[PDB]
Design a binder for these strands. Sequence first.
RNA 1: AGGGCUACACACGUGCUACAAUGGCGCAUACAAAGAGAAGCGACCUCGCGAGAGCAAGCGGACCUCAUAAAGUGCGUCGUAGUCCGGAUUGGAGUCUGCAACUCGACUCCAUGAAGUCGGAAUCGCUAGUAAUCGUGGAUCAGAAUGCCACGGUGAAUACGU
RNA 2: CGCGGGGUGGAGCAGCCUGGUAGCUCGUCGGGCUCAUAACCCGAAGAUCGUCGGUUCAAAUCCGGCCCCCGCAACCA
RNA 3: CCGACUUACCAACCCGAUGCAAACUGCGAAUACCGGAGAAUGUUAUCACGGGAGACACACGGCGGGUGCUAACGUCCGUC
RNA 4: CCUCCUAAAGAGUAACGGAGGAGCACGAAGGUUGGCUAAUCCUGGUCGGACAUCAGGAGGUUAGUGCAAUGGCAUAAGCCAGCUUGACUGCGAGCGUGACGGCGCGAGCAGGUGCGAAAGCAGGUCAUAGUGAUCCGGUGGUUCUGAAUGGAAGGGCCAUC
RNA 5: UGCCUGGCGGCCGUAGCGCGGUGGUCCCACCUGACCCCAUGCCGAACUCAGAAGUGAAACGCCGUAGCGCCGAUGGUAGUGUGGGGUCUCCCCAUGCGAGAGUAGGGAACUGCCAGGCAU
Lengths: 70, 178
Amino acid sequence: MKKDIHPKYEEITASCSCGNVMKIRSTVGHDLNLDVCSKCHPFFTGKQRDVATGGRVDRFNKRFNIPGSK
Amino acid sequence: AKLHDYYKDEVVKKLMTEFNYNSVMQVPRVEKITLNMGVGEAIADKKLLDNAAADLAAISGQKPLITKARKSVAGFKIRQGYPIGCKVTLRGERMWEFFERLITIAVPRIRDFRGLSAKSFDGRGNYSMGVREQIIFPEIDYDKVDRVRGLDITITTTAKSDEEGRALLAAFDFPFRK
RNA sequence: AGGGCUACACACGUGCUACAAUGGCGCAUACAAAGAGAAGCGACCUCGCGAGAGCAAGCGGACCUCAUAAAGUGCGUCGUAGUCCGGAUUGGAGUCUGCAACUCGACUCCAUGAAGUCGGAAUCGCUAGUAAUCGUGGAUCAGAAUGCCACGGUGAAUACGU
RNA sequence: CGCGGGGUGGAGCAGCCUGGUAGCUCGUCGGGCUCAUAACCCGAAGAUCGUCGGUUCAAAUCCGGCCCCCGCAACCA
RNA sequence: CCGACUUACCAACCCGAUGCAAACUGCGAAUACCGGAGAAUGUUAUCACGGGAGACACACGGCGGGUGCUAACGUCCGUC
RNA sequence: CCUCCUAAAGAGUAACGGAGGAGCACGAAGGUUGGCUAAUCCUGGUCGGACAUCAGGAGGUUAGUGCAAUGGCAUAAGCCAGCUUGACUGCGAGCGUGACGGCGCGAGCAGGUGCGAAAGCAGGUCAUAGUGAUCCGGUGGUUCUGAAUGGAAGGGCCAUC
RNA sequence: UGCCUGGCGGCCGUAGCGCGGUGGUCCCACCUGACCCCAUGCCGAACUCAGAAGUGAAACGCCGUAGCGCCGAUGGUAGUGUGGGGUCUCCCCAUGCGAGAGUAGGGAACUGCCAGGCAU
């Protein structure tokens, strides 16, 4: 063994049970149980009565008549 | 190495009964990881081969040493034996410690879709894979902040089936390719 | 009724926009003209990140809104890195008119991301409140311009010679 | 069933002195340019370097077979 | 398009089997040839040294091979 | 002039007879000691290309061989590495070859050098092609010698161009 | 005396290959340790050294196996010397010599020295 760099484990295996900038227990997927699927089904999975941003409540009684400003 | 120590203490004792051998000498092990770093076309530049040798000088205490063209189909200036890569053959403690840096400190290098390929095993006890980037092992947590180059892998095992290939070291937290 | 006028490895005429630093970005901040509005325009106020919506004074405009017009001015920051520039492309979501936004409309938010380093043979407008350069409004118009018509802001260089 | 030279992109021609494609010039193509085109000017593309086989890490280039073109040999009596 | 939904269409690699070779072999004679021992027969054979050559243009034929035409009253060689 | 075939199983052997090579190369492509073993196809992975590499399997030498080809080559005559320069000097029984000059192999001795623990091995390179006899011209060494005597041009001998 | 194993040879290969059964704290191989002598293209893989445990998987080995390499009659056949006959391309007969391939049958080697294990 004509050694050119020295292997050491103490700086890299201690406190490896958590995830941080210096080491992480495991990578993405497998032990991390990450999900990577895609889906569509737009609008109809939710309620169909949806409304725009506005100053009123749902099923309101009136609406301001623009010509009635005179 | 803790990975091999766990494998002989816990996993080998279970593979004995899962494959129901007559002898304890039949249970599989990794023999060697032989490597290549087959970047190619480097005889026309030399600095690319010196930079690939300087990545391999940081994966293990072992020294980098050239791989060469055998069919040599591209051609440059010299006949046949022009260099293409820088090897480093790892065995025992020098391969088991390297696979223990994977998914502990090399987490940005290894992904779920770049995990162990369960379909790539064969009953001869031979395996190979690519990792497309260099992955180093210094005395502390460190990265050389240089990219461009990548590495390829060659492995021999004592496994007598591709199903025993899927059982060898399979208890570790390294992902599987899908 | 639906489709097409909008298709697509091309080329051109005319227009826009960027490559930044006498520029961009975040905050503070100054000084306009003009024009439309009776099933129309619209502040304060309320809701939302926002388009926008709700609520609603005013008005037919010398009575109101677009509107702190922007360039400019004050302060921090970037050093040429394809960027703190450019932001085509492209994914997702929201808003709007209308019978209806699939081919093929407009607006807003989040994310992504490319050519471009001031450009050949060459060429065009302009003599001063002009050019260069910054913003605004309207016709047409269910909705919908980087064109067109009109508006005001900052505001040059050089003119021997024929 | 001889000998010597020749066979290059649309077209003419350089090369090889054993190699590392694509040179030079006219033409073509788009562009500047013109009323328009010749033409000047700017820029780009092309091709089984006769062909199949051999040698080599690499052949238009070196070498053998074969197809094609031109010249020479092609009787003394 | 990786892939695949398809037979209508070609060939030997590989493989089973038949055929074949001056410059293929996996096998392999007869006839020679040469060392050794030996009988009978051969007027000296075989061989060294010395005197003297003639010859160097050989040919139809048999048996064998090249070449030509599996032509030559041919032609080169082996061989009588 | 070399190799295969012509070529006929002792041997020699032709014709513009059929095929291919030779005009040199190597100071490592030599000595010696230790060890190692292929073309090609399949399998496996990707920046990794193209059909390109590491590894494994099959193949079981087809490869490799300084230079075309046959013969030969694993106990390698192929390949890698350490030490090394026997790429020997003076001599050589015997055998092979040609008409002869001349030419190939070689039992073996003395001197001197090197490898290997040591037994043991070392007369260049797997062997054969890579044009040059003799008179003659040049050059290094030379009590071998030089015509009246002593030196000597010069002659001879050896080495080599 | 018999059986089994190991090192080293004989032969010059019916001495082999493939397949199946199946064995070892005698031996052997796998195998453990590396640090020292010794060593690597890097590599304790290889070579080397100090050697524990477990096992009969691989490697090693014995037995069964006639699928394969392979030994192989008799007889005829090809080839061939001499003599006679004789066709242009080469051939017939008498007589001497006489394969190669194939059929039947065979083949799972035989054997020596020395050391170790085991048995009365």
